[PDB]
Amino acid sequence: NENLWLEQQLKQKFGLKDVVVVSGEDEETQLAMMGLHGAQLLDRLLEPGDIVGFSWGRAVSALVENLPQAGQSRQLICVPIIGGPSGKLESRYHVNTLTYSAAAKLKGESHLADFPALLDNPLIRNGIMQSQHFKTISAYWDNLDIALVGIGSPNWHAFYGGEESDDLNARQVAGDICSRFFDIHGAMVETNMSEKTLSIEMNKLKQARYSIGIAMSEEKYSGIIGALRGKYINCLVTNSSTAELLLK
Amino acid sequence: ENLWLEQQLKQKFGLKDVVVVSGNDEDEETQLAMMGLHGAQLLDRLLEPGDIVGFSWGRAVSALVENLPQAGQSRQLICVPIIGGPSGKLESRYHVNTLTYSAAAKLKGESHLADFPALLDNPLIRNGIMQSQHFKTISAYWDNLDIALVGIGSPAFYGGEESDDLNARQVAGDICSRFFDIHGAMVETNMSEKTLSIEMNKLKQARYSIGIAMSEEKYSGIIGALRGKYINCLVTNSSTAELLLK
């Protein structure tokens, strides 16, 4: 109803392909509802043979958990677009867990990543990038059709810790997607991590037919709006509260 | 079901526990599922509160995991991989992380997944990963493991050249991609310097190290595994138990 109008207004303001806006209430409830309607969006946007990429986290999890069980294959390929969280997320939100579950729901194939998302030593990080396994995953990223992505925003402390979060907070980092940081205007911004990361590059993400961000909250507003302005996503699954914030 | 065969294996090889299922002329996949089902009952019987439970990869361990009884109560169990990922060399279904996560759900425990590969291109990278906090955390569980579930490899996955080198080095089988001869002695290969998985010494310290395996070969990887004492329990079939004694 009003949600539909909020969806239309967002499409027009940010040049988006698709938008889902849910009402909600509680926090984790709203996320389940976003996950449900966002999963409905994904299922309609998918095309046979699509390479589908998944980031990690609660938000993407909500969508994957709500995916209808397909009765037939659309020759889909499911791949993670970031390495594993190295213990910093519980297994249920691990990028491989989500990728695997989505492949089962979608009756597709999955190719799981056996490298970490973050490596402290640049040397090791670089060496893994040269292995056949990484190149194989990366080559899927090169041809990504659809991405599902949460939007990070100042876990910010969890992932990056005080020391690195500082540089972020001082560098006016508004948010991140797959551990790729940007300002409120959408501009990329280098960090103590922009060298030690194993995840899809924003340039590649933008080449996807659909990059679907799923996120909510006035707290995450800067992250979400920055992603919109940078065009790192071209679809948005969110709630009415945030929607209105975005239209302000 | 097959109590004499089980006791014969226990006595010959010094095993704590053994399951021998009767494969009634039935095909391989079916026989494996049977092993999985009765092996799962054994694992569930052997668990103690707070056990750290280590899983290798592969479809034999998968058969067992797929057939774990769904626990109603937590036994504060912690499930972990005892080998890195296969780097796309196995279907996702049989990935060690997939198996670990699924085991934890059935056991109402917690899982800690491994975000490093089992086999690296070179020793530099594999040593660097070992210095990482994540690897240290996982390897700490290996150091105090209570129960392990492993398949046993025998003579594609390692490449024709490596395969040939294995054949030339008299390698009869592997556990967690650590290789041994037919008498169960360890053999070091061009891959040991590139491998990230539990050491056999750490596997031997576990209360139960459960091999699940079958073979059509008189001279199998399993007899090696037993002689080397890398496992102290075995889940297998009638035909293999008989071979192991014959």
UniProtKB/TrEMBL annotation, chain A:
GO terms for molecular function: carbohydrate binding; DNA binding; DNA-binding transcription factor activity. This is Probable sor-operon regulator. The gene is sorC. The keyword Magnesium does not apply. Keywords: DNA-binding, Transcription, Transcription regulation. It comes from Shigella flexneri. Residues 1-248 form the Sugar-binding domain. The chain holds residues 60 to 315 of 315 of the full protein. The keyword Lyase does not apply. Belongs to the SorC transcriptional regulatory family. One of its GO terms (biological process) is DNA-templated transcription initiation.
